[PDB]
Design a protein around this ligand. Structure first.
Ligand code: NA
Ligand code: NA
Ligand code: NA
Ligand code: NA
Lengths: 499, 499
């Protein structure tokens, strides 16, 4: 028809989403499909990359069939994704050789430990902006090659390809035409040198990964290829935007300049501040990473990473079966006026910023006989806010900027209790936008800019609108007592080590 | 209708029960009524002594009325009770001047802290067999006298009486005719010297308790007085048995000789070993206490005290609202094969034997995204077994004897999962009797003995019947791994302390 749209695919940790955006920046359709989470041992997290692929096909098809947009009205596709999660597959069959190892997974701990013991952690820090934690892709690749029968040989024979999720989806979607990643996704692999913007041969040799398995690193806004016709209703549509999910949210929050910051509350909680054209080092447990590559420039970021944020609330539903839906948690949490000393430390897959303790597991403290369901749920919800304060403190310290207002996005932001508690505990305003799908919006703009659907990234800034600003309303004394109890809870959590 | 019965009152922490026994030792009727638990602040636990008194009247009435046994068929009454719990009342009005302060309550912490600071713990220990923990009566009397307005003045004037629950009930029931306690209950007050067998002047001065408030200390099997007619359907029935509930259970398990031991799983968990006619000092966190006074002799015991045992299960029911009843916990716990590294340390009111840490609160460890309701419940159930093991390691050290089989009673013993896991985690057989209401039976015998209903306590031994012997079937490697994580769980629990 006459109107054209951009299709954005957000392949998350627990679900895949496809959202259509019109010229005005409005959402013209959304579809979401969950896929299985595998936890074969304590702290491991795996996905079936085949199911992830079918979930992406499922949401593309749903969003095109069920709104008023046909495949021929799609001007371009942007792809964004859960970062670090690693897929290794056979290039001829297109079949993965093992589950995708998820970013959260701690299964590559023995590998990180060995590399740390051999004295290489500083080299990885200096070259990648990360550290030797199980979070990153490199060790997941090594794990697959070392532990899966036949993997090593196939790797040696040139039969295998590596990819983060963006890479996997583009290869499948393009009919094997394009094996690529962008700078933001590559920066999370532990194999890409963020300073010289090239795969690093030393790091690859330390990780025992053959260079023949790697995609070509590209900018985040560029026509990488097109959909193979049979995966897009007979049409060949430009695949033109790719960035890691948290970086996409950064771009979708118009945080384009040095000091601009946002926090995303998803499965995990990720605060990123754009540091412009220079990489900034951190002494307080932040990652130095790449924001995006566009217009021939590369922006870097400082990141605070929290492994379990919104997924703490989901655990209350799926795990303990205490609530029917995440939004229902607010009613329980607000039915009491305090947690009465209870803390929940949801270190289900260890602790990220600033602790970086991959052996810690989840714990709960301050329980008494009068602790009710309301208190427990309330404490679970406040853990999203306490973890964010930990990150903010590290971020304000290392950035040298005092954050006077945080833009936020992700599912948990709809929860007024959590947003207000957040503002209170950090004594900083929290701003929730009208369109909270910033990850999708960012990827849509990367693609749309590449195909000339939009002319300027500033449209994002212009279109952004404040839905609600939460202002701190809690005395310094209460705030400081509450936070001291949180830090004590984390301290106690770190003592529980059995492994 | 000719035949006579003994009525046994068990005034527990969460309910009062009245059980009728015939000459054959058979249960001829049971009535139970719950009363309100008050948790006004975290760690505090209070009861309304007026509601305890009406709950007792209620179960006496229900059990006779509903089993067609006439009041004039009761040959005697035995009273047993939650120990330490403290009532202070006006002798003219019979009205308590405050709630009863429960054994569990931590509200007397500061009072214990001051006496410890002043250097007085080892005097309390040497005289009473106890320690300066909020568990015991003495500091509860002081708290009431210091914090209830006008109370100090009324005490000084002779208007007030003190009683543990036994004393309160006997006073009310006899229409103010008898203000007494037995040696077992008195031994738990922090005011009674267990070696000299008398109220201790030094200890009263330190606690600031006037001696005029104290009842007379008697044997556990003696006619103390009779029911006042209007509280017992026009009859004046001998009140002839009084012992602390755990001591009554010891007696009811036929544990009459040196080395005989039982564990009772109730609100709390209590292991007592009879030590014959001599008091044994503990070096490993056991209390030295009085078992009972009968036939002109006084038996002593060693005790391991766990504050939260079966009440952890009740917490799943009324606190987190995860189960409909304690028995339903079994099906969830056995639906999985292990807790997968989850531990539940139910220190809601601190830790008793052997840690004696009154500031510790409840905690949970080892949580992952895959921890489900079933895991959480199972770990909660195992906590009863781990705490018992802690007490058994202590008990074995400060006695010579290593348990060969443990006689058990209380509400949780009906749960086969728990008894089997208990036997497995300690590598010792557990024997569950056919009649599990040993506390009630013990109190019935103390009464019946005193009125000639039974001529010998040997009948308890002869009537006891094994219902099921649980035999350990767990690999030693597994047992040691499991118990090591429990100990680490407790270590981490002890780190969480707030200001
Ligand atoms: Na997700
Ligand atoms: Na359910
Ligand atoms: Na109990
Ligand atoms: Na007899």
């Amino acid at each position: 028809a006459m109107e054209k749209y951009i299709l954005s695919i957000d392949q998350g940790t627990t679900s895949s989403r496809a959202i259509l955006f019109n010229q005005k920046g409005e959402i013209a359709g959304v579809a979401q499909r969950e896929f299985k989470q595998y936890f074969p041992q304590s702290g491991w997290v795996e996905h079936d990359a085949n199911e992830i692929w079918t979930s992406v096909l499922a949401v593309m098809t749903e969003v095109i069939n069920e709104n008023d947009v046909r495949a021929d009205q799609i001007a371009g596709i942007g792809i964004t994704n859960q970062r670090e999660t690693t897929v290794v597959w056979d290039k001829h069959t297109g079949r993965p050789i093992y589950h995708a190892i998820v970013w959260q997974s701690r299964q590559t701990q023995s590998i990180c430990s060995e590399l740390k013991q051999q004295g290489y952690e500083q080299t990885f820090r200096d070259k990648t902006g990360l550290l030797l934690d199980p979070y990153f892709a490199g060790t997941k690749v090594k794990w697959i090659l070392d532990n899966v029968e036949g993997a090593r040989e196939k790797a040696e024979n040139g039969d295998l390809l590596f990819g983060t999720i963006d890479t996997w989806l583009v290869w499948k979607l393009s009919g094997k035409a394009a094996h690529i990643t962008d700078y933001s996704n590559a920066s999370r692999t532990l194999m890409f040198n963020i300073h010289d913007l090239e795969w690093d041969d030393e790091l690859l040799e330390l990780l025992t990964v053959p260079k023949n398995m790697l995609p070509e690193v590209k900018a985040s806004s560029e026509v990488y290829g097109k959909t193979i016709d049979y995966h897009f209703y007979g049409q060949e549509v430009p695949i033109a935007g790719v960035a890691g999910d948290q970086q996409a949210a950064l771009f979708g929050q118009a945080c384009f300049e040095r000091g601009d910051v946002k926090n995303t509350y998803g499965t995990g909680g990720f605060m990123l501040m754009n540091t412009g054209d220079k990489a900034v080092k951190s002494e307080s447990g932040l990652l130095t990473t790449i924001a995006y590559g566009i217009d021939g420039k590369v922006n870097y970021a400082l990141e605070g990473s929290i492994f379990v944020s919104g997924s703490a609330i989901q655990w209350l539903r799926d795990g303990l079966r205490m609530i029917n839906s995440a939004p229902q948690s607010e009613s329980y949490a607000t039915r009491v006026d305090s947690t009465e000393g209870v803390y929940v430390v949801p270190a289900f897959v260890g602790l990220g910023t600033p602790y970086w303790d991959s052996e810690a597991r989840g714990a709960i403290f301050g329980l008494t006989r009068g602790t009710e369901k309301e208190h427990f749920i309330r404490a679970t919800l406040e853990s999203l806010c306490y973890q964010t304060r930990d990150v903010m403190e590290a971020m304000s310290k290392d950035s040298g900027i005092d954050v006077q207002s945080l833009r936020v996005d992700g599912g948990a932001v709809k929860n007024n209790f959590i947003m207000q508690f957040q503002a209170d505990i950090v004594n900083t305003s929290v701003e929730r936008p009208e369109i909270q799908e910033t990850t999708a919006l960012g990827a849509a703009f990367l693609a749309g800019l590449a195909v000339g659907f939009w002319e300027s990234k500033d449209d994002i800034a212009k279109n952004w609108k404040l839905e609600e600003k939460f202002d701190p309303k809690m005395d310094e004394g209460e705030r400081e007592k509450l936070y001291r109890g949180w830090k004590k809870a984390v301290e106690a959590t770190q003592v529980f080590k059995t492994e």
